[PDB]
Design a binder for this molecule. Sequence first.
Ligand SMILES: [Zn+2]
Ligand SMILES: [Zn+2]
Lengths: 97, 217, 96, 107, 126, 215
Amino acid sequence: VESFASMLRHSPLTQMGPAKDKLVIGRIFHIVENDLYIDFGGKFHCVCRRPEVDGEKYQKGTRVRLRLLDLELTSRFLGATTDTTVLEANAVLLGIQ
Amino acid sequence: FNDKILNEPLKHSDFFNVKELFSVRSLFDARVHLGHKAGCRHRFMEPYIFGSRLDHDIIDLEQTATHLQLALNFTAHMAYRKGIILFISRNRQFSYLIENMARDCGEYAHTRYFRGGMLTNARLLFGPTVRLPDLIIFLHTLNNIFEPHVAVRDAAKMNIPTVGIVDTNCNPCLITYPVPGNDDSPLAVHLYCRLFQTAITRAKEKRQQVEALYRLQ
Amino acid sequence: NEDLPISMENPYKEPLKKCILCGKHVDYKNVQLLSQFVSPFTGCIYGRHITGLCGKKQKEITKAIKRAQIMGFMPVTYKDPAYLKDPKVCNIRYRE
Amino acid sequence: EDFIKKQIEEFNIGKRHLANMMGEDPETFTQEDIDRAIAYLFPSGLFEKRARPVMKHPEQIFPRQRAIQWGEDGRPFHYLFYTGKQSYYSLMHDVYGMLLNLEKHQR
Amino acid sequence: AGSRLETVGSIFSRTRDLVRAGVLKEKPLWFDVYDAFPPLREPVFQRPRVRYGKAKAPIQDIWYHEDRIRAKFYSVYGSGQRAFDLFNPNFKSTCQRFVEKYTELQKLGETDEEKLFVETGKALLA
Amino acid sequence: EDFDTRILEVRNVFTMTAKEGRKKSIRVLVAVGNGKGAAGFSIGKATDRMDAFRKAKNRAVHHLHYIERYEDHTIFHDISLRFKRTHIKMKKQPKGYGLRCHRAIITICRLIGIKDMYAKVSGSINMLSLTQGLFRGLSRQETHQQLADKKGLHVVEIREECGPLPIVVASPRGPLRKDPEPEDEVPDVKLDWEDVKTAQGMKRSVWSNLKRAAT
Ligand SMILES: [Zn+2]
Ligand SMILES: [Zn+2]
């Protein structure tokens, strides 16, 4: 039986290291107008605008490639005791496949 | 003598074999270990957090496994003894899933705006002789302003046991069976719905089996 | 036990950001660099939010500017017109 | 309710008694003829058309009393009972579901 | 009756004390299930508090040895066009290839880090 | 039906309205108890005193506590508690000592079943802090079995009435610890100057040990 420490060490979100500028495949799972709600693994989903070029090749299930800038996107402000999470990650859609 | 269909499961440990529905691998692939950042933590969730990876906290999945065993055992026993299990959430991305899960089982779901006094001014709000739930299971303990849900306090005020998935930014304080785990990922929430639905359905079918056996006996 | 984590100081730690003049010697005779951190129209010494200098360097540039202008090296009310052509390093935007 | 049931019985019997005193003792006394018969029987002379007398089936007279939402087990019938707005939230859940499965397919 | 004092103890403690006194005549449905299988911590109210002086959280940072070389890899040879999948377990990225080959030579028997790096660099070049 | 409700404070409470002006509202505090441990207090507010009384008692029965008693007559130990700015100092006392407490504490302890205890209140005597601090301390007593379980040792009694005879009151329900308790010579405990004054006989009051009626 594998221990949770083993599960973690040999895992791909623990071999990714710092999320910034790491290319990642994701799957569109919801579309509102032109906001594509994609995944990429991770705890949160990213939301990206519809790329107008090839702008019908982005449907529910399409595998896309994302740059990834953040995995949770949060910040503390003036009087706050905790962080203001947007419950969403931050990525830039490069294209398909 | 019906104190053998209401006392027997209570001396068999794991009377419903609920230990074979979840493993630390099943949870890891459901992404239960992934938590929030050190900046959205809670002092009372600190005992359940394995550590922090790249300022992103992770939850100890062995502790999640033990807590989930205890939680699913309790849920199975209340569903067997024919309680009322109310599933409460305020997600908005999983409301459809929780109400459909209640309807596929036979339990109940509050996924909408909790009106003040639902469990507390209950006789005036519903009717003089209402049976309040005998177990409230929160799939997401926080409301939409990222604060603890009124029901967690009012369930305790009204002495209703509570099972709840507590993420890193949550207060595992007034929750009888807290289950340290991710509730922000569709795979995690889907696995929780699947596990609770399976427990409740197996519990009710086993209750029918023992009632049939004693009726024939 | 072998895959439990280990106490170490943070890898992937980016080296601290350094100022444009970190390691260089500011001098009052260097009215070409001092003029860069002044305003073309009024001669106003720029702040940290425009220059992007560390505290040590904003202090040395301010003191060298004041020394040179009272010593007869720098104009006070304008940027010597000969230097409205050098590399701009200040985050300000007058024209539109 | 037993109230509703005996009110019904009493309307039916009183409607037949109404056609006797008039002259339409044949069984089919319509609601328009009922309004006609009570108008004459007891002259109104009141400006409010609700303040005048009336003889309808108890159905329209008495309001809609909602049924009991739980049997003798507790155990409320609808799954969305503890919202307190079962019908509205069931309708909203259904409409959201038809929008969802329609998006999966596609006064 | 019941005790709506959510802050004094737990629901178990309140219910046990009241059925001992004799004011809760029937026990609730969940009491015997609690008494059979209690949680690992009784749900008693605790007020959250801000750490003020020299008090720090016990939570540690997860750092493995391979990360010393992982950080070095990205530094020299940046993140390649071979993109991370993340959706599939057992994904072996190019940096994982690098650490595995590097750790190989390490086990075999080598010493200075720079020599280790150039040897595994030529190994991945092959 | 086994529950007795007794008032503790009635106050005529006023607020100002734009149209009416001074608007009276009766604010009452009542305490309910069956002399077996279950007791609790609550505030009722109304425009009519009967309505305030009804609200207060019917709310306190839903907000009861449970007070543990030594031999159903006294408290387990000595309780010193400052609630806000009210200091309540209570001492466990032997049987037949009576309720030598503040009159509100006497009524509350008759509703709880405590028959013999000493109590002195100082600071601000606010009734709605007195009852709350009293219930806080009495519901946060530590019993003999809990002390035995926490320390792993026998909890035994030494009365001067019986003699040198040891009377075991609470033994641990688990294992027995075998390292003896550390005899910390010259203990670091915060003493009360009133207690030390009474011990040394320099507490001269013409009000202290006065012959009063029963309880
Ligand atoms: Zn969360
Ligand atoms: Zn510098």
